[PDB]
Design a protein around this ligand. Structure first.
Ligand SMILES: O=CCc1ccccc1
Ligand SMILES: O=CCc1ccccc1
Ligand SMILES: [Cu+2]
Ligand SMILES: [Cu+2]
Ligand code: NA
Ligand code: NA
Lengths: 620, 620
């Protein structure tokens, strides 16, 4: 009966029925996004209203619509036509992936470029890449994809090893028109294959690895009820799934004694952007918002027992809508399991004679998505001791180019003739906090160094300082690894037994933020990425750090516009937005398939409990 | 037959026999350190000479000696008397732990302080704390310990919950004399107990945790030969053990094809210091060099199957010398096992139709040491993909004090009346590199941001810059998280197939370095801790970043004196010294026993291989 339950196939079908009857799902309509809306603040009525938000695209040139539907009442609640030149285009459709290649295959300019390189059109794959917003006035209000070409020598060939450099095309995917073909020069197509399953490349497979068996002879320690409600080692939460964001965590709480204490109301990765650092006009426009433009949840993989998730796995199979409103199951799309995590606490005491050891464990909730060449695993971890951690695992195939003869300052050489442009992978975590309830505040904590002198005669003292962020206009913060900077989210109205406000400390990895020039298109469209930490006052419609319609939006929406309201955040319902990412200078070892690299953040209790919360863990 | 084999009990016994016969092990002598010496550079003779270094203390006031012995030839090679006022005192002896408490228990000044607090002398434990070097001229050349008192209410009581603040004493442990008793005022002894095994404190133990079984039905994938030689998934190395440093890794190499490629010649944690940040004269002198003053390897725990190390565990039981030269086995002192480590690489390709997933694993080598209230686990990890990682796990009981009425800028309150002074845990890793051999160099790599303009019209480009460190005087480097700073160790004479020098990249955690005032005693004695990275030219006698005799040494020895030689390090036999640590502001959740916190570093291949080295890993 939970309002945070996953969408069902029947709910999807009812939504389609409602849209159809209203005249909103004609044969030229496509659903570009469908997702359930969270309950509004003040769900204490239990007047459950399951509401869905829908973005409806029109393949015939008519204006798209944003529609809110109530499956509970069977009505359309609102339906607005969108001026996409103003508010941005709808996310890319899966069915548009193929359209770029097919439109180019008949264009005489495209064929002339390929013929000059002696490339058979039937072998040339064209990547469907989001356009961004640059200097081409004719693209305003048109639905544009850009195309970069890769040669497949045979149908099982990895095309990424054969980029066609010096060539790019722009396609209006609604009017079905090739607006520009730009050929800046011929580059050799790199010839080596990158087929990581070819025995000629792998050599004989290792015969030395022996199996690691992980079993739980009595079953797992967590329980799932109502489909998506988890109880594990005093943790309680609901696992949601949204086609744009992927796995979403709701109602994260910890049972401390007889009392259920909230910690986080909603946690998600609300955006992720991959900006490229190559100034070549072939690629200098290239910035993919995997979450906002492509929707990472709709590309979630089906996870295989023993290969993707090892041990005693409980799966969730979330349901999403296809372009026509039909329900589709992502079978085994979410893995859940607990893992041993080494030593939790240990002490051998010289004076009492007591030897004490306890083991740690963590609950893992994860999914894996594939968007073109990239593959990303999203991992949420809950530990016995109250720690919450997020980890992104980046793998797949790096995006390639030619390596220019005579080298490059912005591209790594991976193989003869083959390059990999520098780029970043930048994530935005949206943490709707509820530390013991909704009256929360954020403090910036810095280490303080002290000078030798009176009161510090031996020059050993050091301290810390905490600065309360009181208004949104001062709540845009930068990392400072040197001063050990962290941020504490506390509840000034909830004190622990020492009469200090309860809190959680955010520990960042302090990786570089957005490197692009502050005057660039990408710095305006991904403004969230230029700073490590933002705090806003909660509001229903402030969901994404980039705004609702990221595709071809000209910039400024999202966080910079929210914080301009300068709302009070000192002991209020607040949301923490944390930017974190990887700066990727590709190495030879990343080729022809990338070993996983990771980045993340974590939150640890900071006087939330009255003492260690793991005193009641038994010996193994 | 390996010269890197662990010391045997027979070797220890022969060393004792040799010292005895030479007149160097009389009844008033104590062995304060005994360890095998690594082979000198140029072991290509195989003229194996097992040599041992010994520090010999004299409990009667005679000068201690440093002695080098050859078990291979059965002779004393050299024996030097030490002027400890000049070169420093010998490390603390285990048998001196009890002496501080016993000398104080008869001192009238100590008894007067305790009587004023109504404390029964028989209940008062006195921690044996290293003295450092401060303003007390009478301590120069005397062997001093300082004492801080803790009350045990009964023999199984945790004394740490009952610190006796405002009282400290200094003891000359050779002449058996209490030199000073300082009573700065009475503080209430905190009354709450901290007995983490008391049911009244733990409550009923959890009954919800279900077992995780980790087995290897076919055995582990690694092999151990010659006692301590490891072969695992193309890795090769020898596991050494030294009573001062603990686990030492020798000859780390990777089998790439038919060729054994060196990477690291010797890896160890060569020093670790815990400076305290409380300016109270009771504690402002407090800085423990766990490695240099106490010798962390001699306090290694015996690790229990199922509790400390879980899975298919292979143990090493290293042998050390007791104070009289007898061999003592540390049973099950080192755990070795492989662990599953999630996804190694994954891609589902839209164009080839190939779905690819491989799992990662890591080889774990670990030990756990206990020095007083602190417990530390040292973990070395080898991954399938060439990554080497170190992780320190800090746990145990925090060092306590009274919490002053009216608060403190330098102490955290843990319980009513009970405080925990701020401190750091700072480690020094000594990495004797051998990237494809001994001609190595270090480059500092920074991200470079570029301005929008000609050649970068869209303002998206970014780059990187590498600076070669050519002489020791420029090879003292600071972290810069903001510019993504890392360090690359390469071999300019060994190129990969793209004609670039092979290399490994050091990724630091960029935590704060030593916070103390640069003019402080601790900043001079732990100079290594003030900077993140040092590079020296290799030399046999340059083993520790603090010098050979850390106890009561007045400062300057070690790294600052080494680098003053300003030797060439551009393509030479070099050693990387990396400083890393935790800055610990204790939280309520750290009490009464600390959940593990971690810090570390890692090294990843940087064009060392000609492509991903894990293409030959099979599917699970
Ligand atoms: O992440 C988006 C870049 C991309 C998208 C689709 C195919 C290839 C590359
Ligand atoms: O790490 C050394 C501090 C210490 C040493 C021995 C007993 C208690 C505390
Ligand atoms: Cu990347
Ligand atoms: Cu600590
Ligand atoms: Na909130
Ligand atoms: Na070296």
């Amino acid at each position: 009966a939970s309002p945070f339950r996953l969408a069902s196939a029947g709910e999807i079908s009812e939504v389609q029925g409602i849209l159809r009857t209203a005249g909103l799902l004609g044969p030229e309509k496509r659903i570009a996004y469908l997702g359930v809306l969270d309950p509004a603040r003040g769900a204490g009525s239990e007047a459950e209203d399951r509401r869905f938000r829908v973005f409806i695209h029109d393949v015939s040139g008519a204006r798209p619509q944003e529609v809110t539907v109530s499956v509970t009442n069977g009505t359309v609640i609102s339906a607005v036509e969108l001026d996409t030149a103003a508010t941005g285009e709808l996310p890319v459709l899966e069915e548009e992936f193929e359209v770029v290649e097919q439109l180019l295959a008949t264009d005489e300019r495209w064929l002339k470029a390929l013929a000059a390189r002696n490339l058979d059109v039937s072998k040339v794959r064209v990547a469907p890449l989001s356009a961004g917003v640059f200097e081409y006035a004719e693209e305003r209000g048109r639905r544009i994809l850009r195309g970069l070409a890769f040669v497949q020598d045979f149908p099982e060939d990895s095309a990424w090893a054969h980029p066609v450099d010096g060539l790019v095309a722009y396609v209006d995917v609604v009017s079905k028109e090739v607006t520009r073909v730009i050929d800046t020069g011929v580059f050799p197509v790199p010839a080596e294959h990158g087929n990581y399953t070819d025995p000629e490349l792998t050599g004989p497979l290792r015969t030395t690895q022996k199996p690691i068996s992980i079993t739980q002879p009595e079953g797992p320690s967590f329980t799932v009820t109502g489909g998506n409600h988890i109880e594990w080692e005093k943790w309680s939460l609901d696992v949601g799934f949204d086609v744009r964001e992927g796995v979403v965590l709701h109602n994260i709480a910890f049972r401390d004694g007889d009392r259920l204490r909230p910690i986080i109301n909603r946690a998600s990765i609300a955006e992720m952007v991959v900006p490229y650092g190559d100034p070549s006009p072939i690629r200098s426009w290239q910035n993919y918002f995997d979450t906002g433009e492509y929707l990472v949840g709709q590309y979630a993989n089906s996870l295989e027992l023993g290969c993707d998730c090892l041990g005693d796995i409980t799966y969730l199979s979330p349901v999403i809508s296809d372009a026509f409103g039909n329900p589709r199951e992502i079978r085994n799309g979410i893995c859940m399991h607990e893992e041993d995590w080494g030593i939790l606490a240990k002490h051998s005491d010289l004076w009492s004679g007591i030897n004490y050891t306890r083991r740690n464990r963590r609950m893992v909730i994860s999914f894996f998505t594939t968007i073109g060449n990239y593959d990303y695993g999203f991992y949420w971890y809950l530990y016995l001791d109250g720690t919450i951690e997020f980890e992104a695992k980046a793998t797949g195939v790096v995006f390639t180019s030619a390596f220019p003869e005579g080298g490059s300052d912005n591209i790594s050489q991976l193989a003869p003739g083959l390059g990999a442009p520098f780029h970043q992978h930048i994530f935005s975590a949206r943490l709707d906090m509820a530390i013991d309830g909704f009256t929360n505040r954020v403090e910036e904590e810095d280490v303080v160094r002290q000078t030798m002198g009176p009161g510090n005669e031996r020059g050993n003292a050091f301290s810390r300082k905490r600065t309360v962020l009181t208004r949104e206009s001062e709540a845009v913060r930068e990392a400072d690894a040197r001063t050990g900077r962290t941020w504490i989210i506390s509840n000034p109205e909830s004190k622990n037994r020492l009469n200090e406000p309860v809190g959680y400390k955010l520990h960042a990895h302090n990786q570089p933020t957005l490197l692009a020039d502050p005057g660039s298109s990408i710095a305006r469209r991904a403004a969230f990425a230029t700073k490590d930490l933002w705090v806003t006052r909660y509001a229903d419609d402030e969901r994404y750090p980039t705004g609702d319609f990221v595709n071809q939006h000209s910039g400024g929406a999202g966080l910079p516009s929210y914080i301009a309201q300068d709302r009070d955040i000192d002991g209020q319902d607040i949301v923490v937005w944390h930017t974190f990412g990887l700066t990727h200078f590709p190495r030879v070892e990343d080729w022809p398939i990338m070993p996983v690299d990771t980045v993340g953040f974590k939150l640890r209790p900071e006087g939330f409990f009255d003492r260690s919360p793991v005193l009641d863990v038994p010996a193994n």
